[PDB]
Amino acid sequence: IPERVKSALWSITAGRCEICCKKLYISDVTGSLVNISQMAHIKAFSPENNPHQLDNLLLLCAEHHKMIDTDPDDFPVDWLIKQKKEFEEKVDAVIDTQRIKSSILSFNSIITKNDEIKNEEAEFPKVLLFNDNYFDGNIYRINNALSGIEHDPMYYDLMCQSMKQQIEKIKIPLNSSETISVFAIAPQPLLLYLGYLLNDETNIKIYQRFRTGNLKWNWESSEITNNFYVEQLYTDGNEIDTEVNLILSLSAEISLDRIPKVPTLILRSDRQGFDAIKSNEDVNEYISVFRNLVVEKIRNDFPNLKCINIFPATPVSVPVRMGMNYQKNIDVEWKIFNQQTNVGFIYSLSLKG
Amino acid sequence: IPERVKSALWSITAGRCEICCKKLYISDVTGSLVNISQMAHIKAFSPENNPHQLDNLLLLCAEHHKMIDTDPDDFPVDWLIKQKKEFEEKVDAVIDTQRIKSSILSFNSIITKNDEIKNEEAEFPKVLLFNDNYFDGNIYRINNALSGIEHDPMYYDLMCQSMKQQIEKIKIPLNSSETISVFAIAPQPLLLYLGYLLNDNIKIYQRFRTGNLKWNWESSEITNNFYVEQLYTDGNEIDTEVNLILSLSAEISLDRIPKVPTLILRSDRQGFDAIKSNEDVNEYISVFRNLVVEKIRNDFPNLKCINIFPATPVSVPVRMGMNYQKNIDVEWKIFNQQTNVGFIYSLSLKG
Ligand SMILES: [Zn+2]
Ligand SMILES: [Zn+2]
């Protein structure tokens, strides 16, 4: 008779007789009560910790409370425990259909003020709630420790190495995570490389940052809002060419006089601009058109393919999802370029085996 | 505010934050607590009679309590009610996979002492518990009000009608029952007629001699084979009547049968336990409807009558009367072995 364990047991049972499931917080003819403290009868099997102290007692209504202790013949503790477990496990099986634990991986090379990075990472658990997850306390940050080398030709190489090292330094907590929600925003080559480092570690949700709304990182639609298509800039394929230019024109339409002649394909979205991507479904459809209607088309049209030159103008989630889709030692080398200021499209980094 | 309603709310939620489902009766690092009185935070929208007093507040952990009121922008009360109803209704949907309500219909023309009839009907809700049901308070008894004319040539004629009236007198609560568990024991013609009166979630139970629960099943799986033996070379169209002999409890010898083509429906194991499970009864009814009645309807397109001579446990005639298809089947004349004289006509099933 300790009121704490009573409260816990009333909770595990949803306030019900563990045989007939009568609500013991409701009178048999009217409204409420002083409830399980009075109406309910706990049966103790045989004489603040809890290890199976909860797995000893069981709630009962009046009828079955008598019934089951005045016939220990038909109702052994053997059958009784079976009934207890088979009901409680059907109750707490609601986790299995509720929200799921999810860790958070954050990477922000664009926002520099530290008290603003914190200000903004304060919205991630809310987005997790809005996308059928909940924050399990583990947040992983990729260090922008090299903001000092931000314009040295070697920046990408070193930032890549840093990223790789950190990712591997948390690889075991990454593969063992229930779900990983990623909030990444950085130059498109580094986003691609982040997607490469991850590479479908079971359950990963890649989120997109918008300008508008209370939650910049939350989706703005839950359904497909764009068509993505391909336009090839070469009459038909051959077997001498080893390199192909692939131009992703989602955020803007990249004009060809910016591209350093080599066969080219252009992957467009119908609606171009800041909102080419509005839902996870948009990203899925983009990646489908990308792998099937673009990359595989390139591998077919060019069996002697040795390199793809990627020129992107895409929102943040798209390079990460492209870097996740890479098939190591089955795909070719992917050289990703980045528009440096004034200079045009300049090489940034590469994906290999 | 009052722990009066708090206990009910802790119950509807299974002791959990209605967003993240953290168990609020367990510490984040160790064992138990003083639990939801301390660890939990109820959010009230605005200020022991519960009609939606329960549908106002909601449980929260620390994190999400601090989170959801310091952000009424993303978290309006509309979204909160949506989450609350979804989770709460997702919780109490476990009855839908628990026990099922079941009413009780009792009929005992064999046991006569009144303090023994009640003594024995005190065991029915226990059988309901052991067969995935629970008693919903409604017990229906078919009255053996004619115990005094039990041997008058017309007894059956009257008893049937009595039963019929009683059935109609509760016909409306019978169609509306979640489940109806039947504990019937009487001469096989009356059991057949009871099954006919029912004709429909109905669980027909069998009484055994041995065990703590005479009426509970003794197996949950098939324990017998039922087969047919025909005593006529092939069918014709001149015959209008057929003798059907059900030899489950014993092997009815034919010199007791009042010549007419005959089929015999036997079980491998005959005796008091030819039927041991509901599955045995299902298999019997399958062999009966398909391998017997339809066989006769084929072999005899000018069929006009089936003569039933039974030796079956109590559940079998009731289930046969349940399986009767009115105005598709023919007349079923059911006989009962009366003392010395052999099988004497008892009653009939028609349209
Ligand atoms: Zn109960
Ligand atoms: Zn919570």
Residue numbers in the entry:
A (entry chain B): 16 to 62, 71 to 283, 291 to 383
B (entry chain A): 16 to 62, 71 to 223, 226 to 283, 291 to 383
Give sentences copied directly from the paper behind this entry.
Here, we present the biochemical and structural characterization of two CBASS systems, composed of CdnG and Cap5, from Asticcacaulis sp. and Lactococcus lactis. We show that CdnG from Asticcacaulis sp. synthesizes 3′,2′-cGAMP in vitro, and 3′,2′-cGAMP is the biological signaling molecule that activates Cap5 for DNA degradation. The structures revealed that both Cap5 form homodimers, resulting from the side-by-side packing of two HNH domains.
The different locations of two SAVED domains are responsible for the difference, as the overall structures of the HNH homodimers are similar. In the structure of LlCap5 homodimer, two SAVED domains do not make any contact, and they are far away from each other. Therefore, the structure of LlCap5 can be described as in open configuration. Specifically, a well-coordinated Mg2+ ion is only observed with AsCap5-HNH, and nine residues of LlCap5-HNH near the active site are disordered. Therefore, it is reasonable to conclude that the configuration of LlCap5 shown in Fig. 3a is enzymatically inactive.
